[PDB]
Amino acid sequence: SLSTEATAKIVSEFGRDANDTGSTEVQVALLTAQINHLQGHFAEHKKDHHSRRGLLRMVSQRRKLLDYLKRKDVARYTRLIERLGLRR
Amino acid sequence: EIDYKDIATLKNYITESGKIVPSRITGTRAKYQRQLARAIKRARYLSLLPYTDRH
Amino acid sequence: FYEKPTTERKRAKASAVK
Amino acid sequence: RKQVSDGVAHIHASFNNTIVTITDRQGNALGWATAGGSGFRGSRKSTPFAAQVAAERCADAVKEYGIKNLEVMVKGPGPGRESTIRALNAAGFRITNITDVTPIPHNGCRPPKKRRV
Amino acid sequence: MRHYEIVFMVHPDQSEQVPGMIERYTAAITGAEGKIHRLEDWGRRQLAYPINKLHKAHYVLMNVEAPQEVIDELETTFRFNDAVIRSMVMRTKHAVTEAS
RNA sequence: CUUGAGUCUCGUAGAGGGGGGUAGAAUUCCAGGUGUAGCGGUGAAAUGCGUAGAGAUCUGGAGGAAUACCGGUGGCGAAGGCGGCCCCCUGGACGAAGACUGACGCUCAGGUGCGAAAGCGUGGGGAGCAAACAGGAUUAGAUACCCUGGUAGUCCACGCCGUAAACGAUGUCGACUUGGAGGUUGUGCCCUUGAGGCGUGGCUUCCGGAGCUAACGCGUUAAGUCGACCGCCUGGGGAGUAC
């Protein structure tokens, strides 16, 4: 999971302004924050399959937003996935 | 409103032995019933109210 | 039965519903 | 002998047999008589007509101890549950309380998958 | 920091050391920014059913707003303790005011 | 561009998962006391258990397995499935207003992952229950039903298996199209006086003309009227079999 301030900072620095939750890079980095948190969970349990469905759902939506960055505006894509280390 | 230690207002929602009285005998809207059941079960646990009459 | 009792309690609701 | 004058009567009303044991609160079963073992055997001739036989012999079996008012609690269902109450009460005894405390579970174990026919 | 409205129970025949339980537990929980906001001791009572010897016991509440990490070590302190009988830590239940 | 799809503020419900403990009843076993000749078993019966102290009783103690009542035509989950209680991590869903991106969408051969129960592998555990196997009745016969025992398994961790009448025998997604009565969960307004009335959401069970169907039946959760993709069918057997 992830806290209200933990998402607040993501909306803060990754949004073009305050309350720009919707821009695709805010969503991408917020989803990757959550995924990075949950790897520590799923390394502990390994028999919780009713949560790897949610983890896979958000990894899939992260890839789906990233491809949309790629087509719509390449520069933001190539400036983000190194601010995240993303698209390994 | 409801909790697990208002033990006064629960002997009206169990029988003498402590078997929770159903909803279709009281009609408490399928939600207050769940909350009552949990209150009653954790009151049996904590021994404010008996599991069974021989318990 | 481990599988009937959920069927009779969901059948006899044809018996004793009306 | 000791003449406690009261006691908790036991009716282990099983189905093929209904044995009855008489005792006071400490759990000292002093007397007992078996319905399906009161000379009688079989099943339908060990039914409660035999239960009253067991009740009367047990009353005879402990009449030497002088027990007047009697508590009774029952185990198990079965025909050897009702008629024996009247039998023991009429057999020189006085009642204190009747109950069948047969131990229903909270879903603990497995009893068998018996007859299917 | 989430609200935890807990309940204890100790063997009824050493309520002398119940203040010992207080001076241990309340101090140890206040150490972690804790507050025992609505504490009340119903004291000596009678159970619904016996517990291991005796039909009586000794109810106290603590009902803290504690951080989650220290209350579980409190429960561990219970786990090997002998003078306690049963705990029941709860969760905020959408923290409400005094009960009874 | 904002209506499609998604993020944030905010709460509501839930047997949704995973890991920890924890309670009591109940079977069983063991130890103790009392005292006793039967106990059990079925359509009658023996095998069985027992005179030693069994059954019965209360007193305890060990263990394992499941969680009476609530409980429901209830609820949750993609399905399989998920019911004691409490905590830790977590996954969704829905609803109130908003804000923000701007088509970011639907479907998906191959592919990947979950997959009831049996079953297998290596180590534990093992209360009941119990394929196999023993012994007793039945029958014409009984290798079956029935009884007395009973091993694997059932339980746990890790690994495999991949199947089911895995079924709503109804692929997913979207739009449109008379009504009624319930259920469960949010919420807005109204003297909520209150229970609610007036509305609005979601999920949900049952009637029913249009319409559809061969028919039963479905019938705003469609099997109606359309659209986008995918899977499958092409007489019965052989055969879901050989290779």
Side-chain angles (χ1 to χ4, degrees), chain B:
Chain B
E1 293 179 354
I2 188 54
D3 63 358
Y4 54 69
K5 175 192 211 143
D6 46 356
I7 301 299
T9 61
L10 277 296
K11 270 74 64 181
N12 64 7
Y13 286 156
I14 68 168
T15 188
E16 59 90 20
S17 63
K19 314 163 82 43
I20 303 170
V21 298
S23 177
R24 74 281 191 191
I25 297 170
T26 304
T28 175
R29 293 180 181 177
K31 182 175 174 66
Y32 204 60
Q33 180 63 51
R34 306 179 193 97
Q35 300 176 2
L36 284 168
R38 254 193 271 289
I40 289 170
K41 291 175 185 176
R42 72 162 67 93
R44 305 205 298 250
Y45 184 112
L46 174 45
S47 181
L48 311 172
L49 194 65
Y51 275 61
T52 74
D53 63 358
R54 293 292 92 194
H55 186 273

Side-chain angles (χ1 to χ4, degrees), chain D residues 2-76:
Chain D
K2 304 288 104 176
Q3 188 274 151
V4 188
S5 176
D6 54 356
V8 286
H10 284 121
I11 298 164
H12 187 156
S14 296
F15 292 161
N16 304 357
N17 186 9
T18 61
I19 68 184
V20 65
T21 61
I22 193 66
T23 187
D24 52 67
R25 284 140 301 300
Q26 293 177 335
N28 64 7
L30 78 166
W32 58 274
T34 61
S38 297
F40 294 178
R41 198 53 260 170
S43 69
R44 277 80 65 192
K45 181 267 290 180
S46 72
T47 57
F49 194 10
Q52 63 84 30
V53 174
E56 54 87 19
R57 324 201 301 211
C58 181
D60 197 1
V62 304
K63 193 58 68 179
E64 297 86 3
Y65 264 60
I67 310 300
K68 269 70 66 178
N69 77 319
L70 276 297
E71 177 73 28
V72 65
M73 71 295 278
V74 181
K75 313 312 151 273

Side-chain angles (χ1 to χ4, degrees), chain E residues 87-100:
Chain E
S87 66
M88 185 180 288
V89 176
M90 311 295 268
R91 186 71 179 308
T92 186
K93 294 182 184 292
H94 282 187
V96 194
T97 182
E98 198 275 332
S100 293

